[PDB]
Design a protein around this ligand. Sequence first.
Ligand SMILES: [Ca+2]
Ligand SMILES: [Zn+2]
Lengths: 324, 315
Amino acid sequence: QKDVTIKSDAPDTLLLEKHADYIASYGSDYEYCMSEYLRMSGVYWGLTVMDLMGQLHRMNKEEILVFIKSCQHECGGVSASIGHDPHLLYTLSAVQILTLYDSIHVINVDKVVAYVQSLQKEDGSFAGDIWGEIDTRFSFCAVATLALLGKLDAINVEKAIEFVLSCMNFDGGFGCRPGSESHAGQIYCCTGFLAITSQLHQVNSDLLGWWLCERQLPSGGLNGRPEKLPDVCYSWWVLASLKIIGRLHWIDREKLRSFILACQDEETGGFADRPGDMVDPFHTLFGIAGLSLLGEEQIKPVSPVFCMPEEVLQRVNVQPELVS
Amino acid sequence: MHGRLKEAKRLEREQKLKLYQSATQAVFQKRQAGELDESVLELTSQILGANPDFATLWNCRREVLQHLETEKSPEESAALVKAELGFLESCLRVNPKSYGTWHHRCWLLSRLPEPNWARELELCARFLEADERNFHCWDYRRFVAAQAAVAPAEELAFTDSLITRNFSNYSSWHYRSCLLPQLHPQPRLPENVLLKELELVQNAFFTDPNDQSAWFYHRWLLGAGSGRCELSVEKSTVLQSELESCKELQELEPENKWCLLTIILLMRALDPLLYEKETLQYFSTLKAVDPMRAAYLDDLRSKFLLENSVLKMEY
Ligand SMILES: [Ca+2]
Ligand SMILES: [Zn+2]
């Protein structure tokens, strides 16, 4: 019932040239300045989307590699920006970036591994950093980081699995911690986790698949849970989860595709969360990544687990089997 | 960022920036200098109010509070924690959905000798009456309930009032789904519990047939419970009664897809083979009413038809 109405002059074509221009120029002040606490992830979003569009070369590799090395702390963890504190979120983003650039050597991999290992708790959960916040988002960050590094065996895998499964809910979904309500972002993190650790047989794909496909509103856009507004970044969170569990056809592909394209800004380029809002690189990545999962020919195939081009993951030989 | 709809305004924020930037600079200089003091707390208070997702600044506050506890009197430390609780609450008023703010409050409370958990449960009730879907607040409430050993039964009574007073109800039904199994444990719900729950959810979705949360919870009840098809006379009768009530509702709300799906599910729960004809008829009606779910509905129907072949081959 809560939904947007898409206007009749909303963009209905894919404006790749404009999106690559938008990202290539991003960061040449306010919100920028203000989002510096997530810069490493911001860099990952821009680079990944450019690579999916065949334009990664237009970004600054050498500059990014120096920035990344400057963000690894003595504990082995990586921060969002220079002088900020290390966290699993930005350790993942950094490793995804280095993987895109085949430059893993730029940081101390042994120390990343020991950092991830040190944040696992007795129940198998992961804290995001030394201050102890527990979230299944960090379970995914931990195993996704380690998988890309070839070091999944560094953590207690069965305990980690048991924790994630203790976050499974009556509706087939997953939340932040045990007892937490189902949410598409957490569902992405947990199904991604279970793909990486070879535990998808433990998901009820029909039940969760149903909950996910019921995220699609009359507008064609997807929300993140019952009774919320659609948002372009669920084109990623919901669609990726559906793909992981083999139920992507449970969405109306054409209606979602029209919704996503309506979220483009035809003047600036980029995508916004919903039509006619302000554009950002986060929604630009997730819009483009959603279109690729839906089979858009001008965009490289994207991994639903790692949100990186499949050709990158093929190179590092990390491609978790999904549900057929 | 989300929900950002597309000189004095533009120059004001050029002024915000430059103060935020100088305050930020100053915090990091003080930190590298090892100056873990109140003036840090003053500097970060300015920044965290508007930018609570600046996680490193919450870490700085904790570093300061940790340090000051070492070299301040008990009474001075107590004053600092009470000031922090006030700061946190003022932050939650402007941005009630920040992971950093909720975590800092947990971190703080977990350290106290000492903590007034009843006051924290009340804080939850207030934030939940403002937004009954705020999962951060529900998570914090679960944390507080555990720390203070609040009994499942008490939390169950809290969910009832929330469900009946309105509306907006998914988070409260979800909580019930976790609470009930604790009251009636097992290493699946007991039938008497199940029947009461069915009566409660069925009130909900007849009261507001829109209200997707009751239908989602009801689908769970229908499987939790069971068990199978060794249906008691009472449960058999209750489910047949639900079936007819959904048919009535169908007549009243002919665009309501939730009641149609639920009719199909009820027939499955009652007698898959005896209701095969009607099940197939309902699938057609439902696909026409909810076309976006056509692929899902064909797959569900194919699953049920396979189940039906297997039942007939057990003859
Ligand atoms: Ca370049
Ligand atoms: Zn979004």
